[PDB]
Amino acid sequence: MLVFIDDGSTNIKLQWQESDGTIKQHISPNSFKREWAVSFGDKKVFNYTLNGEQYSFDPISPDTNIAWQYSDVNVVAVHHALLTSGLPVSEVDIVCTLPLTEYYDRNNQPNTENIERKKANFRKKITLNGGDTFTIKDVKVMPESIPAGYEVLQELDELDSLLIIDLGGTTLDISQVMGKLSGISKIYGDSSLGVSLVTSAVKDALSLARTKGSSYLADDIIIHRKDNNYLKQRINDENKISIVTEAMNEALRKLEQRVLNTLNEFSGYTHVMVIGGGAELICDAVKKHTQIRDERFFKTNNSQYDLVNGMYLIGN
Numbered sequence: 001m002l003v004f005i006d007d008g009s010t011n012i013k014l015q016w017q018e019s020d021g022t023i024k025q026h027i028s029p030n031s032f033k034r035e036w037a038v039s040f041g042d043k044k045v046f047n048y049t050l051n052g053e054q055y056s057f058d059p060i061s062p063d064t065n066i067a068w069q070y071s072d073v074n075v076v077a078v079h080h081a082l083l084t085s086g087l088p089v090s091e092v093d094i095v096c097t098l099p100l101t102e103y104y105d106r107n108n109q110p111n112t113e114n115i116e117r118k119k120a121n122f123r124k125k126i127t128l129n130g131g132d133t134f135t136i137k138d139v140k141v142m143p144e145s146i147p148a149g150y151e152v153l154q155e156l157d158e159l160d161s162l163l164i165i166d167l168g169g170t171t172l173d174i175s176q177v178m179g180k181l182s183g184i185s186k187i188y189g190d191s192s193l194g195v196s197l198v199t200s201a202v203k204d205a206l207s208l209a210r211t212k213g214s215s216y217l218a219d220d221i222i223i224h225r226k227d228n229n230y231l232k233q234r235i236n237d238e239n240k241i242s243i244v245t246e247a248m249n250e251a252l253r254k255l256e257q258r259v260l261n262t263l264n265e266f267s268g269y270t271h272v273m274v275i276g277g278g279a280e281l282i283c284d285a286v287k288k289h290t291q292i293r294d295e296r297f298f299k300t301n302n303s304q305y306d307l308v309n310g311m312y313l314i315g316n
């Protein structure tokens with residue numbers, strides 16, 4: 001069994017294909033705490049032991065990004081994602097991801113050290129209370145931005161270049177890749193902002209428990225921010241709707257504000273692709289800004305899965 005895992009620090013996205021050929025996708029959050037959760041009978045709990053420490057899944061409080069890729073929690077969050085994927089517990093080969101500035105050094109040269117460190121991480125032994133855990137055998141690592149733009153790059157001429165814009169949970173990374181992956185023109189990593197900016201704006205606009213718990217509510221609002229019908233039903237208060245919308249827009253304006261300043265650091269690209277969970281949130285601005293023709297602008301309605309799908313297609 002081969003599973004493609006885009007383990008971001010906000011959400012872990014899984015992709016793999018079943019015997020009957022159907023391609024499956026799964027998403028598991030990065031929500032854990034350093035202690036087992038006790039259940040006296042009605043709550044199903046996931047209690048792990050990673051190295052010596054016990055961990056458990058739960059809708060905790062939202063509080064490094066980079067350090068996380070080599071952390072014990074990362075391993076736990078991935079196993080947990082496997083355990084809740086529907087897949088049968090088994091030995092599995094995986095392909096995971098490393099952020100652009102972790103996978104590549106300053107000269108856009110792959111960083112061997114980080115890569116081997118990433119692989120070595122899943123070498124950590126994990127156990128599940130009252131249950132069995134998957135067994136991670138082979139581990140390959142792929143850079144983040146590139147796999148999502150590959151099938152487009154194949155079609156590009158060596159002189160054209162795809163500008164890939166990834167808006168994740170806590171970072172915004174942009175890269176420019178030469179046609180037919182014949183070279184990386186530029187990488188711009190910015191870990192100062194992500195969708196969490198908007199997320200927190202919503203949790204505050206509606207005095208909401210700043211915890212992974214309400215993240216589903218915050219998400220629904222962000223996603224259905226243009227449909228007053230949905231907003232009215234999700235929000236039983238009329239007054240809180242105008243408020244959340246104003247707070248949601250200032251945060252969005254900040255996102256668009258930054259991606260645009262950053263794009264002014266890139267030049268010579270002929271095609272544009274927007275990916276990541278928040279792709280939908282900055283899509284219009286960059287399309288407008290770059291003024292690239294419709295047939296050369298790439299976006300999907302499953303943006304949070306563009307990377308792992310691209311990884312799947314490459315190494316399936």
Ligand SMILES: Nc1ncnc2c1ncn2[C@@H]1O[C@H](COP(=O)(O)OP(=O)(O)O)[C@@H](O)[C@H]1O
Pocket residue numbers: 007008009010011012167168169170171195215219222223276277278279280281303304
């Ligand atoms: N179409 C969308 N519009 C707005 N938010 C989205 C969309 N798809 C996913 N998200 C949200 O963005 C976050 C996931 O973004 P993602 O880039 O996958 O994060 P990660 O940084 O973990 O890789 C989650 O909070 C998720 O609910």
Ligand SMILES: [Mg+2]
Pocket residue numbers: 008168169276
């Ligand atoms: Mg990501």
